[PDB]
Amino acid sequence: RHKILHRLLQE
Amino acid sequence: HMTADLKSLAKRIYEAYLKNFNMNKVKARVILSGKASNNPPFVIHDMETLCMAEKTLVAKQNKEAEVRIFHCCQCTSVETVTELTEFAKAIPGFANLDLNDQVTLLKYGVYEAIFAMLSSVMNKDGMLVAYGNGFITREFLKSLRKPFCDIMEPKFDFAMKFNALELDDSDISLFVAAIICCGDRPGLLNVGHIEKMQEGIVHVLRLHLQSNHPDDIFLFPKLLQKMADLRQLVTEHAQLVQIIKKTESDAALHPLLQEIYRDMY
Ligand SMILES: CC(C)(Oc1ccc(CCNC(=O)c2ccc(Cl)cc2)cc1)C(=O)O
């Protein structure tokens, strides 16, 4: 549900 | 006073804060005061001066003024959420978390942290914008129409009391780390461990406040109260954002901001 926030936490 | 591994935790957090937020209180206060320069920020006090400012932000449109300001706010919000995300990943223990709990901590933390840090860039009459190059007036923000006039004024009210505490950036980074590492956000998986992590930060915050503001002996309990006020402040702000999503056919939220508000309060 929080795809952009997940993305941000990986990079 | 306080041991080493606590001192190490403090400076990790301060340094991560200095690295990830371009605008900070020391820099903001110098602009605001403001010695160091006789070239003050362009003042945005009415509709006409606003348009002047926008003639500069060309590439970065034909919407109502309120909505354009609402857009500038979103852009500032998005990148602060972004910086906050870098900042969190640097707090010892945060990246070790479930990743999910990390999303949840950020989801419920970022706006309390944003409004905490926003105080730095506000005085009784207005706030810095455009990385300190602008200054938009409180009265002008009140002069907008509903519900847009109802967005900043509560933040100002909080900031004036918060700025009375005289925190510096070293206090604020610890305070922001405690906000984010909050053990009672809804949906957290490992409440036990997060709670351990936050009591370490809160402990470093208490001893640091003793050392940095010795005369203000109830500063820490005052800050605890400020954290409760921030939660209330954010709940009400969430309520206003919902009222705007279904009442203003021309203020779409950035996707990342839709992620955060979706299923909050
Ligand atoms: C954008 C919105 C809807 O509400 C918010 C409003 C203000 C702020 C603080 C950061 N905003 C700014 O620094 C800012 C920049 C330009 C202008 Cl014209 C106003 C305010 C954060 C959030 C949000 O919840 O993201």
mmCIF file of C-alpha atoms and ligand atoms in Angstrom:
data_model
loop_
_atom_site.group_PDB
_atom_site.id
_atom_site.type_symbol
_atom_site.label_atom_id
_atom_site.label_comp_id
_atom_site.label_asym_id
_atom_site.label_seq_id
_atom_site.Cartn_x
_atom_site.Cartn_y
_atom_site.Cartn_z
ATOM 1 C CA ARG A 1 0.000 0.000 0.000
ATOM 2 C CA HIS A 2 2.999 2.324 0.557
ATOM 3 C CA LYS A 3 4.933 1.660 -2.633
ATOM 4 C CA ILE A 4 6.733 5.012 -2.883
ATOM 5 C CA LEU A 5 7.676 4.936 0.813
ATOM 6 C CA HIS A 6 9.003 1.368 0.418
ATOM 7 C CA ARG A 7 10.998 2.499 -2.627
ATOM 8 C CA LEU A 8 12.479 5.387 -0.618
ATOM 9 C CA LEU A 9 13.501 3.060 2.220
ATOM 10 C CA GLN A 10 15.403 0.675 -0.100
ATOM 11 C CA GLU A 11 17.582 2.908 -2.296
ATOM 12 C CA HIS B 1 26.762 12.832 33.115
ATOM 13 C CA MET B 2 26.138 10.397 30.249
ATOM 14 C CA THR B 3 28.239 7.496 28.965
ATOM 15 C CA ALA B 4 29.915 6.994 25.581
ATOM 16 C CA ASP B 5 27.425 4.854 23.642
ATOM 17 C CA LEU B 6 24.822 7.481 24.576
ATOM 18 C CA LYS B 7 27.114 10.297 23.402
ATOM 19 C CA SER B 8 27.692 8.311 20.209
ATOM 20 C CA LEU B 9 23.929 7.983 19.725
ATOM 21 C CA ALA B 10 23.472 11.742 20.141
ATOM 22 C CA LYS B 11 26.068 12.842 17.585
ATOM 23 C CA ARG B 12 24.984 10.211 15.070
ATOM 24 C CA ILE B 13 21.534 11.788 15.243
ATOM 25 C CA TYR B 14 22.722 15.409 15.138
ATOM 26 C CA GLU B 15 25.104 14.756 12.245
ATOM 27 C CA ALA B 16 22.415 12.877 10.336
ATOM 28 C CA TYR B 17 20.169 15.887 10.918
ATOM 29 C CA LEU B 18 22.746 18.423 9.697
ATOM 30 C CA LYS B 19 23.369 16.290 6.622
ATOM 31 C CA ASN B 20 19.746 15.680 5.572
ATOM 32 C CA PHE B 21 17.919 19.039 6.123
ATOM 33 C CA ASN B 22 19.227 21.895 3.991
ATOM 34 C CA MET B 23 17.333 24.440 6.098
ATOM 35 C CA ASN B 24 17.933 24.337 9.845
ATOM 36 C CA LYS B 25 17.359 26.632 12.781
ATOM 37 C CA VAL B 26 20.801 28.250 12.944
ATOM 38 C CA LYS B 27 20.607 29.069 9.217
ATOM 39 C CA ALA B 28 16.967 30.144 9.477
ATOM 40 C CA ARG B 29 17.509 32.400 12.485
ATOM 41 C CA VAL B 30 20.383 34.185 10.736
ATOM 42 C CA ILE B 31 18.217 34.934 7.703
ATOM 43 C CA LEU B 32 15.324 35.962 9.954
ATOM 44 C CA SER B 33 17.171 38.194 12.420
ATOM 45 C CA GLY B 34 19.019 39.003 10.368
ATOM 46 C CA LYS B 35 22.670 40.048 10.473
ATOM 47 C CA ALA B 36 25.120 38.378 8.074
ATOM 48 C CA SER B 37 23.244 40.035 5.196
ATOM 49 C CA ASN B 38 21.413 43.230 4.279
ATOM 50 C CA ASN B 39 19.657 41.509 1.332
ATOM 51 C CA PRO B 40 16.480 40.161 2.980
ATOM 52 C CA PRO B 41 14.137 37.556 1.483
ATOM 53 C CA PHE B 42 11.484 38.680 -0.957
ATOM 54 C CA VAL B 43 8.308 39.292 1.037
ATOM 55 C CA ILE B 44 5.065 37.722 -0.180
ATOM 56 C CA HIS B 45 2.362 39.800 1.536
ATOM 57 C CA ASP B 46 -0.539 39.890 -0.956
ATOM 58 C CA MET B 47 -1.757 38.581 -4.295
ATOM 59 C CA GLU B 48 0.458 40.921 -6.328
ATOM 60 C CA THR B 49 3.750 40.062 -4.632
ATOM 61 C CA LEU B 50 2.824 36.381 -4.882
ATOM 62 C CA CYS B 51 2.585 36.611 -8.666
ATOM 63 C CA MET B 52 5.950 38.389 -8.746
ATOM 64 C CA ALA B 53 7.472 35.412 -6.901
ATOM 65 C CA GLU B 54 5.817 32.949 -9.275
ATOM 66 C CA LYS B 55 7.245 34.770 -12.301
ATOM 67 C CA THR B 56 10.571 33.399 -11.056
ATOM 68 C CA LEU B 57 9.404 29.798 -10.554
ATOM 69 C CA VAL B 58 8.561 29.449 -14.269
ATOM 70 C CA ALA B 59 9.581 25.923 -15.291
ATOM 71 C CA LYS B 60 8.570 24.635 -11.854
ATOM 72 C CA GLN B 61 -0.078 27.129 -13.137
ATOM 73 C CA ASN B 62 -3.344 28.665 -14.309
ATOM 74 C CA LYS B 63 -5.102 27.463 -11.151
ATOM 75 C CA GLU B 64 -6.623 29.585 -8.408
ATOM 76 C CA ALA B 65 -4.015 31.241 -6.192
ATOM 77 C CA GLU B 66 -4.949 29.106 -3.178
ATOM 78 C CA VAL B 67 -4.331 25.945 -5.203
ATOM 79 C CA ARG B 68 -0.915 27.130 -6.407
ATOM 80 C CA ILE B 69 0.185 27.802 -2.825
ATOM 81 C CA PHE B 70 -1.222 24.373 -1.955
ATOM 82 C CA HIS B 71 1.095 23.021 -4.652
ATOM 83 C CA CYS B 72 4.180 24.795 -3.306
ATOM 84 C CA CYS B 73 3.341 23.300 0.097
ATOM 85 C CA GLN B 74 3.144 19.787 -1.368
ATOM 86 C CA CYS B 75 6.549 20.148 -3.049
ATOM 87 C CA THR B 76 8.092 21.265 0.251
ATOM 88 C CA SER B 77 6.284 18.423 2.054
ATOM 89 C CA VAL B 78 7.449 15.766 -0.408
ATOM 90 C CA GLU B 79 11.111 16.630 -0.073
ATOM 91 C CA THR B 80 10.907 16.959 3.715
ATOM 92 C CA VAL B 81 9.324 13.500 3.895
ATOM 93 C CA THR B 82 12.200 12.429 1.637
ATOM 94 C CA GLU B 83 14.873 13.957 3.857
ATOM 95 C CA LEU B 84 13.105 12.601 6.963
ATOM 96 C CA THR B 85 13.330 9.162 5.358
ATOM 97 C CA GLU B 86 17.095 9.465 4.921
ATOM 98 C CA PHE B 87 17.328 10.797 8.478
ATOM 99 C CA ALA B 88 15.389 7.844 9.932
ATOM 100 C CA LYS B 89 17.524 5.250 8.154
ATOM 101 C CA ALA B 90 20.499 6.773 10.022
ATOM 102 C CA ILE B 91 19.030 6.405 13.540
ATOM 103 C CA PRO B 92 20.709 3.359 15.155
ATOM 104 C CA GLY B 93 18.202 0.530 15.224
ATOM 105 C CA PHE B 94 15.750 1.989 12.697
ATOM 106 C CA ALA B 95 16.943 0.214 9.561
ATOM 107 C CA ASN B 96 17.147 -3.022 11.597
ATOM 108 C CA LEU B 97 13.358 -2.868 11.983
ATOM 109 C CA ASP B 98 10.836 -5.050 10.160
ATOM 110 C CA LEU B 99 10.591 -2.691 7.176
ATOM 111 C CA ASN B 100 6.850 -2.256 7.399
ATOM 112 C CA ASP B 101 7.282 -0.999 10.896
ATOM 113 C CA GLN B 102 9.669 1.404 9.149
ATOM 114 C CA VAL B 103 6.907 2.445 6.755
ATOM 115 C CA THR B 104 4.489 2.726 9.669
ATOM 116 C CA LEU B 105 6.846 4.815 11.821
ATOM 117 C CA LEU B 106 7.469 7.160 8.884
ATOM 118 C CA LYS B 107 3.775 7.204 7.964
ATOM 119 C CA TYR B 108 2.695 8.499 11.395
ATOM 120 C CA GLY B 109 5.944 10.295 12.224
ATOM 121 C CA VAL B 110 6.767 12.529 9.289
ATOM 122 C CA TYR B 111 4.129 15.225 9.736
ATOM 123 C CA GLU B 112 4.675 15.585 13.476
ATOM 124 C CA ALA B 113 8.375 15.942 12.650
ATOM 125 C CA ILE B 114 7.595 18.379 9.818
ATOM 126 C CA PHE B 115 5.542 20.695 12.025
ATOM 127 C CA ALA B 116 8.140 20.456 14.781
ATOM 128 C CA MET B 117 10.888 21.552 12.368
ATOM 129 C CA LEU B 118 8.635 24.102 10.627
ATOM 130 C CA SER B 119 8.794 26.253 13.791
ATOM 131 C CA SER B 120 12.479 26.917 13.027
ATOM 132 C CA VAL B 121 11.480 28.783 9.858
ATOM 133 C CA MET B 122 8.583 30.780 11.404
ATOM 134 C CA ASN B 123 8.298 33.963 13.431
ATOM 135 C CA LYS B 124 5.174 35.743 14.646
ATOM 136 C CA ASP B 125 4.638 37.409 11.238
ATOM 137 C CA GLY B 126 5.467 34.776 8.621
ATOM 138 C CA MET B 127 7.708 31.966 7.488
ATOM 139 C CA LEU B 128 10.708 31.415 5.230
ATOM 140 C CA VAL B 129 10.015 29.717 1.896
ATOM 141 C CA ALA B 130 12.032 28.723 -1.178
ATOM 142 C CA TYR B 131 15.048 27.613 0.836
ATOM 143 C CA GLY B 132 15.141 30.915 2.695
ATOM 144 C CA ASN B 133 14.818 33.140 -0.366
ATOM 145 C CA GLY B 134 11.183 34.027 0.332
ATOM 146 C CA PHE B 135 9.130 35.135 3.311
ATOM 147 C CA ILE B 136 5.355 34.711 3.092
ATOM 148 C CA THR B 137 3.317 36.578 5.695
ATOM 149 C CA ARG B 138 1.002 35.029 8.257
ATOM 150 C CA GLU B 139 -1.706 37.631 7.571
ATOM 151 C CA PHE B 140 -1.561 36.858 3.853
ATOM 152 C CA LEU B 141 -2.040 33.135 4.582
ATOM 153 C CA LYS B 142 -5.039 34.010 6.752
ATOM 154 C CA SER B 143 -6.372 36.199 3.917
ATOM 155 C CA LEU B 144 -6.880 33.206 1.603
ATOM 156 C CA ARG B 145 -10.324 31.613 1.319
ATOM 157 C CA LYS B 146 -11.540 28.505 3.117
ATOM 158 C CA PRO B 147 -10.320 25.995 3.751
ATOM 159 C CA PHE B 148 -6.874 27.123 2.579
ATOM 160 C CA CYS B 149 -6.657 29.944 5.115
ATOM 161 C CA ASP B 150 -7.098 27.238 7.781
ATOM 162 C CA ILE B 151 -3.868 25.307 7.123
ATOM 163 C CA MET B 152 -0.939 27.351 8.432
ATOM 164 C CA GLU B 153 -2.385 29.414 11.275
ATOM 165 C CA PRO B 154 -2.509 26.391 13.648
ATOM 166 C CA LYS B 155 1.114 25.647 12.735
ATOM 167 C CA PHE B 156 2.025 29.253 13.598
ATOM 168 C CA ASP B 157 0.211 28.986 16.939
ATOM 169 C CA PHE B 158 2.254 25.876 17.753
ATOM 170 C CA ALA B 159 5.495 27.389 16.478
ATOM 171 C CA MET B 160 5.271 30.530 18.632
ATOM 172 C CA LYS B 161 4.990 28.469 21.835
ATOM 173 C CA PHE B 162 7.516 25.884 20.603
ATOM 174 C CA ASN B 163 10.078 28.573 19.701
ATOM 175 C CA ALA B 164 9.702 29.950 23.231
ATOM 176 C CA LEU B 165 11.593 26.825 24.386
ATOM 177 C CA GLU B 166 14.777 28.140 22.678
ATOM 178 C CA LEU B 167 15.803 24.725 21.364
ATOM 179 C CA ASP B 168 18.856 24.611 19.129
ATOM 180 C CA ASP B 169 19.458 22.118 16.324
ATOM 181 C CA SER B 170 21.059 19.575 18.656
ATOM 182 C CA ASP B 171 17.876 19.457 20.773
ATOM 183 C CA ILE B 172 15.637 19.361 17.715
ATOM 184 C CA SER B 173 17.375 16.405 16.053
ATOM 185 C CA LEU B 174 16.949 14.292 19.184
ATOM 186 C CA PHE B 175 13.338 15.466 19.469
ATOM 187 C CA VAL B 176 12.684 14.546 15.850
ATOM 188 C CA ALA B 177 14.287 11.125 16.345
ATOM 189 C CA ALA B 178 12.024 10.490 19.342
ATOM 190 C CA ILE B 179 8.967 11.503 17.296
ATOM 191 C CA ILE B 180 9.814 9.016 14.549
ATOM 192 C CA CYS B 181 10.825 6.127 16.851
ATOM 193 C CA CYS B 182 7.403 6.121 18.487
ATOM 194 C CA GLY B 183 6.299 2.827 20.017
ATOM 195 C CA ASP B 184 2.523 3.386 19.840
ATOM 196 C CA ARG B 185 1.838 4.027 16.177
ATOM 197 C CA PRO B 186 -1.122 1.938 14.968
ATOM 198 C CA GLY B 187 -0.252 -1.338 13.273
ATOM 199 C CA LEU B 188 3.299 -1.666 14.593
ATOM 200 C CA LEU B 189 4.476 -5.288 14.627
ATOM 201 C CA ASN B 190 7.337 -5.311 17.151
ATOM 202 C CA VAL B 191 6.065 -2.801 19.692
ATOM 203 C CA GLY B 192 8.380 -4.271 22.317
ATOM 204 C CA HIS B 193 11.588 -3.609 20.393
ATOM 205 C CA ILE B 194 10.665 -0.182 19.001
ATOM 206 C CA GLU B 195 9.783 0.816 22.568
ATOM 207 C CA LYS B 196 13.259 -0.239 23.693
ATOM 208 C CA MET B 197 14.743 1.820 20.880
ATOM 209 C CA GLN B 198 12.743 4.950 21.711
ATOM 210 C CA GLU B 199 13.476 4.850 25.449
ATOM 211 C CA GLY B 200 17.161 4.995 24.515
ATOM 212 C CA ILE B 201 16.621 8.099 22.360
ATOM 213 C CA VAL B 202 14.281 9.700 24.906
ATOM 214 C CA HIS B 203 16.918 8.996 27.561
ATOM 215 C CA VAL B 204 19.629 10.688 25.503
ATOM 216 C CA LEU B 205 17.183 13.555 24.922
ATOM 217 C CA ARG B 206 16.555 13.989 28.662
ATOM 218 C CA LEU B 207 20.233 14.046 29.654
ATOM 219 C CA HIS B 208 21.101 16.243 26.691
ATOM 220 C CA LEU B 209 18.407 18.754 27.683
ATOM 221 C CA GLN B 210 19.773 18.775 31.237
ATOM 222 C CA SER B 211 23.243 19.598 29.925
ATOM 223 C CA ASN B 212 22.197 22.051 27.215
ATOM 224 C CA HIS B 213 19.478 23.966 29.155
ATOM 225 C CA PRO B 214 20.326 23.493 32.848
ATOM 226 C CA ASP B 215 18.067 26.267 34.186
ATOM 227 C CA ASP B 216 14.979 25.060 32.274
ATOM 228 C CA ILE B 217 14.667 22.023 34.488
ATOM 229 C CA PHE B 218 11.231 20.901 33.227
ATOM 230 C CA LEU B 219 12.194 21.311 29.546
ATOM 231 C CA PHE B 220 11.931 17.554 28.990
ATOM 232 C CA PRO B 221 8.357 17.254 30.370
ATOM 233 C CA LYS B 222 7.518 20.375 28.353
ATOM 234 C CA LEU B 223 8.848 18.588 25.272
ATOM 235 C CA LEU B 224 6.800 15.502 26.175
ATOM 236 C CA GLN B 225 3.724 17.768 26.163
ATOM 237 C CA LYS B 226 4.793 19.189 22.795
ATOM 238 C CA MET B 227 4.830 15.640 21.395
ATOM 239 C CA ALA B 228 1.229 15.106 22.498
ATOM 240 C CA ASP B 229 0.310 18.509 21.002
ATOM 241 C CA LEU B 230 2.003 17.537 17.729
ATOM 242 C CA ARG B 231 -0.135 14.389 17.563
ATOM 243 C CA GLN B 232 -3.288 16.440 18.071
ATOM 244 C CA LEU B 233 -1.998 19.022 15.578
ATOM 245 C CA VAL B 234 -1.420 16.323 12.963
ATOM 246 C CA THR B 235 -4.791 14.650 13.559
ATOM 247 C CA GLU B 236 -6.583 17.941 12.956
ATOM 248 C CA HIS B 237 -4.360 18.635 9.940
ATOM 249 C CA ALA B 238 -5.208 15.196 8.556
ATOM 250 C CA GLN B 239 -8.895 16.053 8.987
ATOM 251 C CA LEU B 240 -8.454 19.232 6.938
ATOM 252 C CA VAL B 241 -6.583 17.336 4.191
ATOM 253 C CA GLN B 242 -9.508 14.919 3.899
ATOM 254 C CA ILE B 243 -11.957 17.836 3.659
ATOM 255 C CA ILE B 244 -9.855 19.159 0.772
ATOM 256 C CA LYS B 245 -9.562 15.848 -1.119
ATOM 257 C CA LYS B 246 -13.368 15.758 -1.429
ATOM 258 C CA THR B 247 -14.305 19.418 -1.840
ATOM 259 C CA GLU B 248 -11.595 21.000 -4.011
ATOM 260 C CA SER B 249 -11.670 19.403 -7.457
ATOM 261 C CA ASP B 250 -8.303 20.967 -8.270
ATOM 262 C CA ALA B 251 -5.918 20.128 -5.389
ATOM 263 C CA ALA B 252 -4.660 16.630 -6.128
ATOM 264 C CA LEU B 253 -2.148 15.259 -3.648
ATOM 265 C CA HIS B 254 1.261 14.059 -4.721
ATOM 266 C CA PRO B 255 1.213 10.225 -4.849
ATOM 267 C CA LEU B 256 3.681 9.924 -1.965
ATOM 268 C CA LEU B 257 1.449 12.186 0.124
ATOM 269 C CA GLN B 258 -1.609 10.092 -0.763
ATOM 270 C CA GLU B 259 0.316 7.067 0.518
ATOM 271 C CA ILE B 260 0.855 8.688 3.919
ATOM 272 C CA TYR B 261 -2.686 9.993 4.448
ATOM 273 C CA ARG B 262 -4.357 6.796 3.194
ATOM 274 C CA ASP B 263 -5.763 5.011 6.277
ATOM 275 C CA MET B 264 -4.280 7.358 8.898
ATOM 276 C CA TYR B 265 -6.798 8.855 11.356
HETATM 277 C C1 LIG C 1 1.245 20.238 1.939
HETATM 278 C C2 LIG C 1 0.312 19.785 3.068
HETATM 279 C C3 LIG C 1 -1.077 19.607 2.470
HETATM 280 O O1 LIG C 1 0.260 20.692 4.164
HETATM 281 C C4 LIG C 1 1.483 21.277 4.563
HETATM 282 C C5 LIG C 1 1.651 22.656 4.573
HETATM 283 C C6 LIG C 1 2.871 23.211 4.959
HETATM 284 C C7 LIG C 1 3.935 22.397 5.333
HETATM 285 C C8 LIG C 1 5.292 22.985 5.760
HETATM 286 C C9 LIG C 1 6.270 23.051 4.575
HETATM 287 N N1 LIG C 1 5.796 24.048 3.626
HETATM 288 C C10 LIG C 1 6.618 25.169 3.214
HETATM 289 O O2 LIG C 1 7.713 25.334 3.650
HETATM 290 C C11 LIG C 1 6.004 26.155 2.227
HETATM 291 C C12 LIG C 1 6.590 26.471 1.005
HETATM 292 C C13 LIG C 1 5.958 27.388 0.167
HETATM 293 C C14 LIG C 1 4.755 27.978 0.561
HETATM 294 CL CL1 LIG C 1 3.909 29.163 -0.470
HETATM 295 C C15 LIG C 1 4.185 27.654 1.776
HETATM 296 C C16 LIG C 1 4.808 26.743 2.603
HETATM 297 C C17 LIG C 1 3.762 21.025 5.321
HETATM 298 C C18 LIG C 1 2.547 20.472 4.942
HETATM 299 C C19 LIG C 1 0.709 18.371 3.482
HETATM 300 O O3 LIG C 1 0.055 17.785 4.385
HETATM 301 O O4 LIG C 1 1.669 17.785 2.905
#
